[PDB]
Structures are given as structure tokens and as C-alpha cells.
Design a protein around this motif. Structure first.
Motif, mmCIF file in Angstrom:
data_model
loop_
_atom_site.group_PDB
_atom_site.id
_atom_site.type_symbol
_atom_site.label_atom_id
_atom_site.label_comp_id
_atom_site.label_asym_id
_atom_site.label_seq_id
_atom_site.Cartn_x
_atom_site.Cartn_y
_atom_site.Cartn_z
ATOM 1 N N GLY A 115 -9.360 -2.105 -3.248
ATOM 2 C CA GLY A 115 -8.906 -3.156 -2.330
ATOM 3 C C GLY A 115 -9.747 -3.256 -1.068
ATOM 4 O O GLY A 115 -10.148 -4.353 -0.682
ATOM 5 N N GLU A 116 -10.022 -2.112 -0.435
ATOM 6 C CA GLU A 116 -10.846 -2.054 0.780
ATOM 7 C C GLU A 116 -12.215 -2.664 0.520
ATOM 8 O O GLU A 116 -12.759 -2.570 -0.593
ATOM 9 C CB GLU A 116 -11.058 -0.614 1.267
ATOM 10 C CG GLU A 116 -9.843 0.295 1.231
ATOM 11 C CD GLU A 116 -9.054 0.348 2.524
ATOM 12 O OE1 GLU A 116 -9.394 -0.381 3.489
ATOM 13 O OE2 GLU A 116 -8.079 1.140 2.569
ATOM 14 N N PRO A 126 -11.586 10.238 -3.244
ATOM 15 C CA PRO A 126 -12.734 9.346 -3.136
ATOM 16 C C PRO A 126 -14.092 10.067 -3.166
ATOM 17 O O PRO A 126 -14.147 11.290 -2.985
ATOM 18 C CB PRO A 126 -12.515 8.710 -1.753
ATOM 19 C CG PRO A 126 -11.970 9.838 -0.940
ATOM 20 C CD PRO A 126 -11.184 10.737 -1.911
ATOM 21 N N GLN A 147 -3.624 4.916 -4.780
ATOM 22 C CA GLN A 147 -4.834 5.327 -4.076
ATOM 23 C C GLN A 147 -6.025 4.526 -4.604
ATOM 24 O O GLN A 147 -6.848 4.031 -3.827
ATOM 25 C CB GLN A 147 -5.037 6.820 -4.321
ATOM 26 C CG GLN A 147 -6.042 7.538 -3.444
ATOM 27 C CD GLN A 147 -6.430 8.914 -4.008
ATOM 28 O OE1 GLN A 147 -5.959 9.336 -5.098
ATOM 29 N NE2 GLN A 147 -7.295 9.625 -3.270
ATOM 30 N N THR A 148 -6.103 4.382 -5.928
ATOM 31 C CA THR A 148 -7.237 3.699 -6.559
ATOM 32 C C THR A 148 -7.241 2.193 -6.267
ATOM 33 O O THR A 148 -8.299 1.603 -5.995
ATOM 34 C CB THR A 148 -7.303 3.977 -8.086
ATOM 35 O OG1 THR A 148 -7.260 5.390 -8.321
ATOM 36 C CG2 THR A 148 -8.598 3.490 -8.633
ATOM 37 N N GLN A 149 -6.059 1.577 -6.324
ATOM 38 C CA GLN A 149 -5.910 0.160 -5.975
ATOM 39 C C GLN A 149 -6.281 -0.092 -4.509
ATOM 40 O O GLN A 149 -6.981 -1.052 -4.197
ATOM 41 C CB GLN A 149 -4.481 -0.337 -6.270
ATOM 42 C CG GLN A 149 -4.059 -0.281 -7.752
ATOM 43 C CD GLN A 149 -4.749 -1.324 -8.632
ATOM 44 O OE1 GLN A 149 -5.854 -1.101 -9.132
ATOM 45 N NE2 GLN A 149 -4.083 -2.455 -8.849
ATOM 46 N N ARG A 150 -5.811 0.781 -3.621
ATOM 47 C CA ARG A 150 -6.115 0.676 -2.198
ATOM 48 C C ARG A 150 -7.621 0.812 -1.952
ATOM 49 O O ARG A 150 -8.212 0.029 -1.201
ATOM 50 C CB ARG A 150 -5.335 1.730 -1.409
ATOM 51 C CG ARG A 150 -5.826 1.942 0.022
ATOM 52 C CD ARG A 150 -4.765 2.565 0.914
ATOM 53 N NE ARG A 150 -5.304 2.803 2.253
ATOM 54 C CZ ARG A 150 -4.583 2.831 3.372
ATOM 55 N NH1 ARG A 150 -3.269 2.626 3.341
ATOM 56 N NH2 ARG A 150 -5.187 3.058 4.534
ATOM 57 N N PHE A 151 -8.226 1.797 -2.609
ATOM 58 C CA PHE A 151 -9.653 2.100 -2.442
ATOM 59 C C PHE A 151 -10.497 0.891 -2.826
ATOM 60 O O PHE A 151 -11.331 0.434 -2.038
ATOM 61 C CB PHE A 151 -10.044 3.325 -3.280
ATOM 62 C CG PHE A 151 -11.486 3.739 -3.128
ATOM 63 C CD1 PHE A 151 -11.867 4.604 -2.119
ATOM 64 C CD2 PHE A 151 -12.465 3.248 -3.992
ATOM 65 C CE1 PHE A 151 -13.201 4.989 -1.965
ATOM 66 C CE2 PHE A 151 -13.802 3.628 -3.851
ATOM 67 C CZ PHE A 151 -14.168 4.504 -2.835
ATOM 68 N N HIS A 193 -16.511 -7.380 -5.525
ATOM 69 C CA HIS A 193 -17.415 -6.751 -4.546
ATOM 70 C C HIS A 193 -18.735 -6.452 -5.232
ATOM 71 O O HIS A 193 -18.826 -6.531 -6.455
ATOM 72 C CB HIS A 193 -16.823 -5.443 -3.995
ATOM 73 C CG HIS A 193 -16.577 -4.406 -5.047
ATOM 74 N ND1 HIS A 193 -15.362 -4.280 -5.689
ATOM 75 C CD2 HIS A 193 -17.394 -3.473 -5.595
ATOM 76 C CE1 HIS A 193 -15.437 -3.300 -6.576
ATOM 77 N NE2 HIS A 193 -16.657 -2.794 -6.538
#
Ligand SMILES: Cc1cn([C@H]2C[C@H](O)[C@@H](COP(=O)(O)OP(=O)(O)O[C@H]3O[C@@H](C)[C@H](O)[C@@H](O)[C@H]3O)O2)c(=O)[nH]c1=O
Ligand SMILES: Cc1cn([C@H]2C[C@H](O)[C@@H](COP(=O)(O)OP(=O)(O)O[C@H]3O[C@@H](C)[C@H](O)[C@@H](O)[C@H]3O)O2)c(=O)[nH]c1=O
Lengths: 198, 198
Positions: A197-198, A67, A191-195, A41
Motif C-alpha cells: 500500500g505504501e 520488511p 503487514q503485507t497489504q500495508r507495505f 508501483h
């Protein structure tokens, strides 16, 4: 530019292409295309900070709550620092582990520290200047510290010259890793991977 | 952080708030809130460049065709440079005029050069390191040059020891301001106006 992921996932060492001529030198410190190529990103640069430190100064260990936490793209433009990243993401397969890079004005490497990691450095020479791009503006209520000499984390600081490092009052008063874990402020690996990831 | 608009509109000298302590110093070089306060929009950092120059090296005069051109947020992190902005915007109330900012590792000022302006600097010491945030990635086709010592622009470069500047092959081959005017490559004033207005 080359980018090598560190032993702490989500941190990378970047190597610039330095163009040298009779005038001095030139390099592209960051490009959007180059950053996307390793991170997946674009880096949303919301702040850029600069510090200058004398030999033996240790700044850290610092992180920002998720976050949005605060990713950092960090380099040394004069002198040299021993730079460390620590996996403080609860549940991480590599929780409590650390890695390091030498940032200096010779090889002019960079470390990218993704969201939810802890980061610090020890200046190896006087007048060591560090610049870093940040993914979030300063938020002193959401930015926190961990004792850089925590015995569980056991970071192997190349102390100058084995002499105690010089710390700010803030960093000298930094709570133990144990205490920070009890506080609920640490990010979770999921949480960090998901964040990101988004 | 305080921003002072130069005699060339659309260029600003920014003075930092420098936080001095036992360790050395810290400053917020760019903040989103601080940048918006003077510029009226956020800086979209798409590239960041670094150059290091010996005393008497002159880099410039450089500009990028509009649109999107390339805004630059420029600072010197070691040594010192005499930084110049030139109003090359045909139709500008200040067309053909220039202003300057002393960028050094003492007062640690910054110049912001908006889209459609020309820019250059003369290094005043050896090992002078300049870093700049860019609103656009490198575009060799749309980035152009004007002879730094052009007689019409008559920029008062404080020549190091009074000696002729040391230029790259590209900067030494740079066309006169006259030739650039005839080329059609210069931006128009109201064109820069509506571009930045949008
Ligand atoms: C971090 C920061 C500090 N400051 C100010 C407050 C103080 O007066 C002065 C010094 O603050 P300190 O928190 O002691 O800065 P420091 O240089 O010890 O902190 C930095 O350490 C690095 C290792 C981390 O990666 C960074 O995220 C940052 O925490 O700078 C800002 O204005 N904005 C900022 O973003
Ligand atoms: C500007 C630029 C140059 N280059 C390359 C081409 C050369 O091999 C090497 C040095 O290029 P030069 O054009 O000689 O760099 P330079 O330091 O003379 O150019 C710079 O001068 C500043 C005053 C301007 O404001 C900038 O826009 C930039 O043009 O780097 C890039 O790779 N990326 C870039 O973004």
C-alpha cells in the motif's frame, strides 16, 4: 502485455507480445509502464538472478521476511518449469492456498510474485533456465525455506516421472509449514497489504 | 563477479561467479552492490528486452540519442553471440574504435554498454537468446542505427560460414557512419562524461 491475477492474490501471470520474423523473435520482457499498470508501483530491480536445472529438479519453497521481503518477476528462457506460488501470509483470506503457471520457452509467460509470498518450481526438461528480477538484494539471513512437499500445503507437483524430485541439501532439510508458522518468520496479511500500500 | 573495462571506455566485460551443484547452476547476474562497484551509480532498470536469433543473424549497430540515451546490461542465456561495442562519441580519445565480448551459455559473460555508445551482435548458433536490462524504455524517435558492415568502422564480424549476415529491413537500411556523423545525432564525449558524471 496482458496480466492476469492468480487465485493467490498478489501473484500475476504475464503474457508477452512476441514479435516473430525470419531472424527469430523479439519481446519486451518488462516495461516500467507495463509493470506499473498491474502492480500500482514501479519495480525497483535491485538484483537479477539466473539458474539452470536438469529435469526433475525442484527449487523451493522460498520466501523473504517482511520488511522489505523480495518481490520476483520470473520467466523461463529455455526448457520449461512448473512454477508455484503459496499464500503464507498469516491472516490472509487465502492462507495456505497455492496456484501455478507453466513457464516455458514456447509461450514465454512470466509470474510476478509480490512481497511476502512463497515460491518454487519443478523443472520439466533438462537445461531449463530461469531468470528473475528481484526487488531486494540477496539476504541469506532473511530468506527462508518451507518443505516443498509439505502435506498441509499439498502442492500437486507433476513429478518427473512421478519419481522423487531432486532437491538441494538446503531444500531437502527445509522445515515443515507447521514449524515455519511456529517460528514467527511468516509475514502477516495486514503487514503485507500495508507495505505494498505504501 | 569481476568487471574488466574494454578498450572502449564506458563498456565493461563482466564475468560471473557461477555456483555449480547437483541441480545445475546458479549465478547472480546483476547485483546493485556489484554494478555500483564498477559503474559508480545504480542501474535504473526501466525495461528488459529479449531476442532469440538464428545463426548468422546480425542485430545492430544501435544507439540512443543522449540524453538520456539507453544503457544496456547484456547477456546470452543460450547459444552464443559475438557482441560489439563502438565508440561513436565525437571527441572521444578512442572515437571510431570498437571492442568485443563473446557472450554465451558456457562462460556466461555480460557486457555493460553505457549511454551514448553503439552496440550490436552476431548470433553464432541457432536459438541464441540474448537478454538485456535497459536504463530507458523504448523510444523509437531517439533510437537510431548505423550500418553494421560500415567500411570505416570495419568491424571484424566472424561471419557464420563466411556468409553475409542476415539483417532486418531496418538494419539493412541503416545509414553509413559518415551519414550519421553529418546528421548531428551522435553524442559528444564530454557530453557523455558529464551525463554519467552527474
Ligand atoms: C538465492 C541466491 C543464491 N545464491 C547462491 C548460494 C548458493 O551457492 C547457490 C544456490 O543457492 P540456493 O538458495 O540453493 O538457490 P535456489 O535456486 O534453490 O533459490 C532460489 O529459489 C527460487 C525458487 C526462489 O524464488 C528464489 O528466491 C531463490 O531462493 O546460489 C546467491 O549467491 N544469491 C542468491 O540470491
Ligand atoms: C528495441 C525495441 C524494438 N522493438 C520492436 C520493433 C520491432 O517490431 C521488433 C524488433 O525490433 P528491431 O529494432 O528489429 O529489434 P533489434 O533486436 O534489431 O533491436 C535491438 O538490437 C540491439 C543490438 C540493440 O542494442 C537494442 O537497442 C535494440 O535496438 O521489436 C520494441 O518493440 N521495443 C524495443 O525496445
Amino acid at each position: 502485455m496482458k496480466a492476469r491475477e492468480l487465485d493467490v492474490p498478489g501473484a500475476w501471470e504475464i503474457t508477452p507480445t512476441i514479435h516473430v520474423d525470419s531472424r527469430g523473435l523479439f519481446f519486451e520482457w518488462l516495461t516500467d509502464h507495463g509493470f506499473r499498470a498491474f502492480a500500482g508501483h514501479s519495480l525497483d530491480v535491485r538484483q537479477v538472478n539466473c539458474s539452470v536445472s536438469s529435469a526433475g529438479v525442484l527449487r523451493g519453497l522460498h520466501f523473504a521476511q517482511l520488511p522489505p521481503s523480495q518481490a520476483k518477476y520470473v520467466t523461463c528462457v529455455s526448457g520449461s518449469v512448473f512454477d508455484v506460488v503459496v499464500d503464507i501470509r498469516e491472516g490472509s483470506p487465502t492462507f495456505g492456498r497455492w496456484d501455478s503457471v507453466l513457464l516455458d520457452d514456447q509461450d514465454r509467460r512470466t509470474i510476478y510474485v509480490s512481497e511476502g509470498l512463497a515460491h518454487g518450481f519443478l523443472a520439466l526438461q533438462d537445461n531449463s533456465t530461469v531468470m528473475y528480477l528481484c526487488s531486494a538484494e540477496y539476504n541469506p539471513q532473511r530468506e527462508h525455506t518451507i518443505c516443498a512437499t509439505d502435506p498441509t500445503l499439498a502442492v500437486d507437483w507433476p513429478l518427473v516421472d512421478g519419481a522423487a524430485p531432486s532437491l538441494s541439501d538446503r531444500d531437502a532439510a527445509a522445515p515443515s509449514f507447521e514449524d515455519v508458522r511456529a517460528s514467527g518468520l511468516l509475514p502477516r496479511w495486514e503487514q503485507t497489504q500495508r507495505f505494498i500500500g505504501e
